[PDB]
Amino acid sequence: MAFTPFPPRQPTASARLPLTLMTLDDWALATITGADSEKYMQGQVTADVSQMAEDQHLLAAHCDAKGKMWSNLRLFRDGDGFAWIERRSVREPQLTELKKYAVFSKVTIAPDDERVLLGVAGFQARAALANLFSELPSKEKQVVKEGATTLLWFEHPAERFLIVTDEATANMLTDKLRGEAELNNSQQWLALNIEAGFPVIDAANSGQFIPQATNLQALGGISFKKGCYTGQEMVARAKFRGANKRALWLLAGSASRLPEAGEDLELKMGENWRRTGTVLAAVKLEDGQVVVQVVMNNDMEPDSIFRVRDDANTLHIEPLPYSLE
């Protein structure tokens, strides 16, 4: 786009990451302006956009009438409305459905490729950026703005900033960090999301899942006390129904082919069925390992083995770093 992707480098896991400047091509930014921004957005999204502070960002879901997840998104206030970040593969559809019902609202809804999405993660990310900015988001102030730049603070798996900015500023930031930081691309970011249990939704699955199919309730993206949003019945239904459909899973292990988005998984007839889950996202790490993010029944034990339908290797199960209770 406005900004050339950095070439890929084998992604690692959070634990021993050196300073990393990343270019987030596989993500995409969109906005909404107008007098009816709050009103309109509030009814379209699972998160209570009203008590959204000037300094916060959240992972809302966005559903269809039936409570089906069009996509999830990181929302934050921007201008007189909101901006949000989500996977590139889905921006278009989504924005299209979003704009369909904006007909009676004083509201302007657009993609934004003029702005650049960067990631800074790894070893002393905080201290590196601190020489380039007067203020940095923190746990207590999770969104901070400085010139053409908006910084979002993340805590998992280890503390990264997500930077939304100008081409000029990206150039500056890039020229100033090139030397002391590795450059990587989306997959390093993606690996950190997968490592953290944070649902990733690509076009192949927009429409397939209930927010909680995906652990969203666990990550603060559903408001149950709020007024009304498309699909809220279904969503609230699924909470009180008690019966918990499925969930979002972390699978590891070596692999030849990269799992694609929306591909069946295979369980082990040790005492169990066969063709089981669906596939959210995957990254080949250094090892020769992959890490896969999947949606399966909340029912399966520190036992089971799987493998993308058309592949053939020991996939097992790594524990979500957050509690589903």
Closest CA to 166 of 138, 145, 192: 145
Amino acid at 313: N
Residues composing the chain: 325
Residue tagged 């930077």 (tokens):
163
The answer to the question of residue 2 being in a domain is no
The answer to the question of residue 131 being in a domain is yes
Closest CA to 26 of 193, 175, 165, 150: 193
**CA 5/CA 129 separation, integer angstroms:** 20
- Please give the C-alpha separations between residue 211 and each of 153, 165, 246, in angstroms, as whole numbers: 23, 29, 10
Residues 6+ apart with CB under 8 A from 229: 42, 43, 44, 45, 46, 63
Alpha-helical runs (H) found in 159-296: 167-177, 186-196, 232-240
**CA 84/CA 76 separation, integer angstroms:** 6
CATH number at residue 53: 3.30.70.1400
The answer to the question of residue 211 being in a domain is yes
**CA 1/CA 280 separation, integer angstroms:** 25
Query: What phi-psi label fits residue 38: left (phi over 0), alpha (psi between -120 and 50 degrees) or beta?
Result: alpha
- Both 290 and 201 in one domain: the answer is yes
Total domain count for the chain?
A: 3
Helix/strand/coil for 9: coil
Question: Backbone phi, then psi, for 151, in 5-degree steps?
Answer: -110, 130
Query: Buried b / exposed e across 173-187, counting CB within 10 Å, b at 16+?
Result: bbeebeeebbbbbbb
Looking at residue 5, what DSSP letter applies? Answer: P
Q: Are strands 182-185 and 20-23 parallel, antiparallel or unpaired?
A: parallel
- Both 21 and 150 in one domain: the answer is yes
CATH number at residue 18: 3.30.70.1630
- Both 48 and 167 in one domain: the answer is no
**CA 267/CA 275 separation, integer angstroms:** 6
CA-only gyration radius of the chain, Å = 20
- Both 148 and 208 in one domain: the answer is no
CATH number at residue 210: 2.40.30.160
- Side-chain-side CA neighbours of 89 within 13 Å: the count stands at 15
Q: Around Cβ 240, how many Cβ atoms within 10 Å?
A: 8
Amino acid at 68: K
27 is in an annotated binding site: yes
Q: Which domain holds residue 243?
A: 197-318
The resolution of the experimental structure, rounded to one decimal in Å, is 2.8
Which tokens go with 86?
A: 């989500």
153 is in an annotated binding site: no
- Both 122 and 19 in one domain: the answer is yes
Residue finishing a domain among 161, 196, 231: 196
Helices (H) and strands (E) in the chain, counts: 6, 15
**CA 182/CA 112 separation, integer angstroms:** 27
Helix/strand/coil for 132: coil
* Sheet of 69-78, strands arranged across: 58-63, 69-78, 81-87, 27-33, 108-112
Amino acid at 105: S
Residue finishing a domain among 91, 113, 135: 113
- Both 286 and 265 in one domain: the answer is yes
